């Protein structure tokens, strides 16, 4: 499955994940593209943040669904 991750600055990174993929990897997956340590990421789908011990099927993320990435300075 293919999802997106729009940030505030503008960068619209495009990812490859499994509907029931853990946010743990999702992040390191973004990390593998943009190089941003996970311990400094923040995903937001439907006005809500996405904890680590969960997946995508836990937040229900269709194919080609957009996620918001913000950085915790």
């Amino acid at each position: 499955m293919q999802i997106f991750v729009k940030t505030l600055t503008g960068k619209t990174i495009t990812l490859e994940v499994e509907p029931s993929d853990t946010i743990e990897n999702v992040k390191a997956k973004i990390q593998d593209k943009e190089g941003i340590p996970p311990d400094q990421q923040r995903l937001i789908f439907a006005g809500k943040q996405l904890e680590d011990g969960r997946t995508l099927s836990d937040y229900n993320i269709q194919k080609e669904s957009t996620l918001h990435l913000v950085l915790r300075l």
């Binding site: 006005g47 809500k48 943040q49």
Partner: protein, 93 residues
């Protein structure tokens, strides 16, 4: 003149962006129903919101009888404010 038009729209995208992601979190925001990082983030998006709204004032303050530019600058600022007060309430309620 060249890409100063983009560098512009680029700041606008950022403004509307937040105004978007903040009112999104407010919508799914309930007292008991919500986490610590969930809301706190909002309150953080909130801080950065007051700022850009402030920047939009600086770019305003540097415009002489210019069409759109101001209209567009003041418009975004206007949602920024709307969302700022919006947040104020929703969080306090």
């Amino acid at each position: 003149g060249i890409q100063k038009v983009t560098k512009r729209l680029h700041t606008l995208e950022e403004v509307n962006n937040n105004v978007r992601l903040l009112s999104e979190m407010l919508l799914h925001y309930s007292q008991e129903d919500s986490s610590d990082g969930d809301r706190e983030l909002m309150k953080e998006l909130f801080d950065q919101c007051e700022n850009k709204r402030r920047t939009l004032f600086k770019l305003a303050s540097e415009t002489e009888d210019n069409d759109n530019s101001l209209g567009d600058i003041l418009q975004a600022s206007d949602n920024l404010s709307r969302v700022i007060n919006s947040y104020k309430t929703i969080i306090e309620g």
